[PDB]
């Protein structure tokens, strides 16, 4: 029960700030401000009302878990992990003491735990980012999936409650994509000579 | 009517959890995602398959399946004792006698190896004939009366269930004609 | 068994053809031809002796499992999965009938299941390949980890016995590197400001 | 020094029931090395299952005690005491508030007190032997260079309401073991 789990992350629409526009498969999201203009949006307790955030529908209370996100050409983004119990309403600071563990692109710089005091000196534009959780280790880590190089581990934290995948978009009409877990030929006929270059 | 019309009802206890059997147990559709069902021994847990409630032990029987313009489907019979847990190739040797459509226009028989079928008309409705004793299963266009394929002089040693399989999420269900 | 397992693949030196030279951490391997010249090499029923192969020490009898392999240095290679019971002493075709599920590079071509009749028309050089196993599904699949695109799924096969990660080097002097599973800060002091750009 | 002589030399023996599975306790129960990989041991309630820690068998409940630890030229080690009641399952920050009073070395030349927040210690000479002095009643544990007598670090906030075990932690795989000098 020490296996690294490669998570299949699907966004939970009930968490999504109203300016967030999810794809129908809930594996991609963009931010379109005032898209509900002229609408009354019901303000259910799960939804982020100020921070343009969305969570994965998965919760983790134990073990090791990771997923990958495509962030190419998105100028303002946040990825990471947050407690299921985080404040949804108002302008909460996205920091470990409030139950958020993040890597952020902000004004051409990468920032650990969304802090202007932790600029990470990367020598390339991130394209595919690995998000890693080890619950018992208090570990949230980030990876550059181009070379599988370590970027950052947050200070070790007692999670205490279940945690979930966390996403923020701070710019408009710029989608991020959550990379599906590999499934092989799941749900597909495999010809007797094999299946080639499936899409 | 050379052959007894079988009254075929889908056994929800056999349906892969990604399958939805209708209230009347005559039609099956695919869910986006698996339902939360137990893995009882009767359930196909890998193949997207569902059996009829009744199997055949002897005599001559017939039923009809409405496929509509569904892009993907396979139907036929299988032995009581096929592998329901994990993938097994659906072929005579593994206890499956089936044919169908894949990718909107590719008709095959699930033989070892598979064979392509040349069908003048594409069927909206298929008839399945079983003769336990001779050892014959035949597929016809139910409208045209046009032949499709036959397995000949098979040596059945077990009860045979009707079997239905759909991989794709489309709006057309697969429907047993009462 | 719902879960996709990201495997941490460590090579088993007892399986390794004698010309294969493992790294100390056993996560990379190169072929050094006739490197036991003038030596008597002891008998070992686990060891591949006809072809320069080595297995992952892990074996799988169920579930879904994958790992990634860096092949950018190498142009004569085979990777995938084999039965634990495969022939080790005699030379066999590295095909599903003999308990091998492989992607091969040979003479500038990618060959599915090591077959001259299954040339994969790829438009780029592969650098990082994903090897995917779904035991119940009879599924071994290969991905191009550049864009995580599907390359090939082998014909579905009843594995029957435990299967293992499979590696082979042909007329080749460059190393294969098996990408370790991500571990975060496992085994390491994390400062109170976090751990930045950790290098192993 | 008269003050040194107030401290009873403690006879400290490593308790294998407490050792994280990736630790190897020697035959004589005085020495600890790291294995390459966890051994197949039970997760009994006594065992540290996350931190690479091992306790002595005897805990302190009163009085003044001294033990000495050979660190030689190990590049990573941490030692001190911890409460009976510390969290042994999963990561917990080794700090006074969680019931740990330890200092040590990381990265060959970075000496720290494991407090909140961590502090970098100045060690004009790197120690090869560390003297550990515990005064239960004054809640004091002091660390010294046991060869040249120089002071390294003192906690004056040790629990005087909990039994205290010697605790020993190694993360790295290296030739030099961590060794307790028997009381002599
Ligand atoms: C549920 C599923 C994906 C079945 C496909 O089976 P297969 O790959 O053995 O192909 P077929 O039976 O269609 O030839
Ligand atoms: C076993 C292990 C990896 C411990 C390090 O703990 P930590 O990251 O809390 O650091 P430290 O206690 O050395 O400050």
CSV table of C-alpha atoms in Angstrom, one decimal, chain B residues 34-177:
chain,number,residue,atom,x,y,z
B,34,UNK,CA,-19.4,2.5,-14.4
B,35,UNK,CA,-22.3,2.2,-11.9
B,36,UNK,CA,-21.4,1.1,-8.3
B,37,UNK,CA,-22.5,-2.6,-8.5
B,38,UNK,CA,-21.1,-5.6,-6.7
B,39,UNK,CA,-18.8,-8.0,-8.7
B,40,UNK,CA,-21.1,-11.1,-8.2
B,41,UNK,CA,-19.9,-14.2,-10.1
B,42,UNK,CA,-22.6,-13.8,-12.9
B,43,UNK,CA,-21.4,-10.2,-13.8
B,44,UNK,CA,-19.1,-9.6,-16.8
B,45,UNK,CA,-16.6,-7.3,-15.1
B,46,UNK,CA,-14.4,-6.5,-18.1
B,47,UNK,CA,-16.3,-7.0,-21.4
B,48,UNK,CA,-19.2,-4.6,-21.9
B,49,UNK,CA,-21.6,-7.6,-22.1
B,50,UNK,CA,-25.1,-8.6,-20.7
B,51,UNK,CA,-26.7,-12.1,-21.0
B,52,UNK,CA,-30.4,-13.1,-21.3
B,53,UNK,CA,-32.0,-14.7,-18.2
B,54,UNK,CA,-32.8,-18.0,-20.0
B,55,UNK,CA,-30.1,-20.2,-21.7
B,56,UNK,CA,-30.7,-22.9,-24.4
B,57,UNK,CA,-30.0,-26.7,-23.6
B,58,UNK,CA,-31.7,-28.1,-26.8
B,59,UNK,CA,-34.1,-27.5,-29.8
B,60,UNK,CA,-34.3,-24.7,-32.3
B,61,UNK,CA,-34.8,-21.0,-31.2
B,62,UNK,CA,-34.9,-17.5,-32.8
B,63,UNK,CA,-34.9,-13.9,-31.6
B,64,UNK,CA,-34.5,-10.4,-33.2
B,65,UNK,CA,-32.3,-7.4,-32.1
B,66,UNK,CA,-32.9,-3.8,-33.2
B,67,UNK,CA,-29.4,-2.3,-33.8
B,68,UNK,CA,-30.8,0.9,-35.5
B,69,UNK,CA,-27.9,3.0,-37.0
B,70,UNK,CA,-25.7,2.3,-33.8
B,71,UNK,CA,-22.0,2.6,-34.9
B,72,UNK,CA,-20.8,-0.4,-32.7
B,73,UNK,CA,-22.4,-3.6,-31.4
B,74,UNK,CA,-21.8,-7.4,-31.2
B,75,UNK,CA,-24.5,-10.1,-30.5
B,76,UNK,CA,-24.8,-13.9,-30.6
B,77,UNK,CA,-24.6,-16.6,-27.9
B,78,UNK,CA,-22.0,-17.9,-25.4
B,79,UNK,CA,-21.6,-20.9,-23.1
B,80,UNK,CA,-22.8,-20.8,-19.5
B,81,UNK,CA,-19.1,-21.3,-18.5
B,82,UNK,CA,-17.3,-18.5,-20.5
B,83,UNK,CA,-14.7,-16.3,-18.5
B,84,UNK,CA,-16.7,-13.3,-17.1
B,85,UNK,CA,-13.7,-12.0,-15.0
B,86,UNK,CA,-11.0,-10.2,-17.1
B,87,UNK,CA,-10.6,-10.1,-20.9
B,88,UNK,CA,-11.0,-13.3,-22.9
B,89,UNK,CA,-11.1,-13.2,-26.7
B,90,UNK,CA,-14.7,-13.6,-27.9
B,91,UNK,CA,-14.2,-16.6,-30.2
B,92,UNK,CA,-15.8,-20.1,-30.7
B,93,UNK,CA,-12.8,-21.7,-28.8
B,94,UNK,CA,-13.5,-19.5,-25.7
B,95,UNK,CA,-17.3,-20.2,-26.0
B,96,UNK,CA,-18.6,-17.2,-27.9
B,97,UNK,CA,-20.4,-17.2,-31.3
B,98,UNK,CA,-20.9,-13.5,-32.2
B,99,UNK,CA,-20.7,-11.0,-35.0
B,100,UNK,CA,-21.3,-7.3,-35.3
B,101,UNK,CA,-20.3,-3.8,-36.4
B,102,UNK,CA,-17.3,-1.6,-35.4
B,103,UNK,CA,-16.4,2.0,-36.5
B,104,UNK,CA,-19.7,2.7,-38.2
B,105,UNK,CA,-19.1,0.4,-41.3
B,106,UNK,CA,-16.8,-2.6,-40.4
B,107,UNK,CA,-18.9,-5.9,-40.0
B,108,UNK,CA,-17.0,-8.9,-38.6
B,109,UNK,CA,-17.5,-12.4,-37.2
B,110,UNK,CA,-15.7,-12.8,-33.9
B,111,UNK,CA,-13.8,-15.9,-35.2
B,112,UNK,CA,-10.2,-16.9,-34.5
B,113,UNK,CA,-9.0,-15.1,-36.5
B,114,UNK,CA,-11.7,-12.3,-37.1
B,115,UNK,CA,-13.2,-12.2,-40.7
B,116,UNK,CA,-14.6,-9.1,-42.5
B,117,UNK,CA,-18.2,-9.5,-43.9
B,118,UNK,CA,-19.4,-8.0,-47.2
B,119,UNK,CA,-23.0,-6.8,-46.5
B,120,UNK,CA,-25.0,-5.3,-49.4
B,121,UNK,CA,-27.5,-3.5,-47.0
B,122,UNK,CA,-26.5,-2.5,-43.4
B,123,UNK,CA,-29.0,-4.1,-41.0
B,124,UNK,CA,-31.3,-2.1,-38.7
B,125,UNK,CA,-32.6,-5.3,-37.2
B,126,UNK,CA,-30.9,-8.7,-36.9
B,127,UNK,CA,-32.3,-12.2,-36.5
B,128,UNK,CA,-30.4,-15.0,-34.6
B,129,UNK,CA,-31.2,-18.7,-35.2
B,130,UNK,CA,-29.8,-21.4,-32.9
B,131,UNK,CA,-30.2,-25.3,-33.5
B,132,UNK,CA,-28.7,-26.9,-30.4
B,133,UNK,CA,-28.5,-30.4,-31.9
B,134,UNK,CA,-27.2,-29.8,-35.5
B,135,UNK,CA,-24.9,-27.1,-33.9
B,136,UNK,CA,-25.7,-24.1,-36.1
B,137,UNK,CA,-26.1,-20.4,-35.3
B,138,UNK,CA,-27.1,-18.0,-38.1
B,139,UNK,CA,-27.5,-14.2,-38.5
B,140,UNK,CA,-29.9,-12.6,-40.9
B,141,UNK,CA,-31.1,-9.0,-41.8
B,142,UNK,CA,-34.6,-9.3,-40.1
B,143,UNK,CA,-36.1,-6.8,-42.7
B,144,UNK,CA,-34.5,-8.0,-46.0
B,145,UNK,CA,-34.3,-11.7,-45.0
B,146,UNK,CA,-30.7,-11.3,-46.3
B,147,UNK,CA,-28.1,-13.9,-44.8
B,148,UNK,CA,-25.2,-12.4,-42.7
B,149,UNK,CA,-23.1,-15.4,-41.4
B,150,UNK,CA,-23.5,-19.0,-40.0
B,151,UNK,CA,-21.4,-21.1,-37.6
B,152,UNK,CA,-21.9,-24.8,-38.8
B,153,UNK,CA,-21.8,-28.2,-37.1
B,154,UNK,CA,-20.5,-26.9,-33.7
B,155,UNK,CA,-20.4,-29.5,-30.8
B,156,UNK,CA,-22.1,-27.6,-27.9
B,157,UNK,CA,-21.4,-29.3,-24.5
B,158,UNK,CA,-23.1,-26.5,-22.3
B,159,UNK,CA,-26.2,-24.3,-22.0
B,160,UNK,CA,-26.1,-21.3,-24.4
B,161,UNK,CA,-27.1,-17.7,-23.4
B,162,UNK,CA,-27.9,-14.8,-25.8
B,163,UNK,CA,-25.1,-12.1,-25.4
B,164,UNK,CA,-25.0,-8.4,-26.3
B,165,UNK,CA,-21.9,-6.1,-26.2
B,166,UNK,CA,-21.6,-2.3,-26.8
B,167,UNK,CA,-18.4,-0.3,-26.4
B,168,UNK,CA,-19.5,3.1,-27.6
B,169,UNK,CA,-21.5,5.9,-25.9
B,170,UNK,CA,-24.2,6.8,-28.6
B,171,UNK,CA,-27.9,7.7,-28.4
B,172,UNK,CA,-29.3,4.5,-30.2
B,173,UNK,CA,-29.7,1.7,-27.6
B,174,UNK,CA,-29.7,-2.0,-28.5
B,175,UNK,CA,-33.3,-3.4,-28.2
B,176,UNK,CA,-34.6,-7.0,-28.0
B,177,UNK,CA,-37.9,-7.3,-30.0
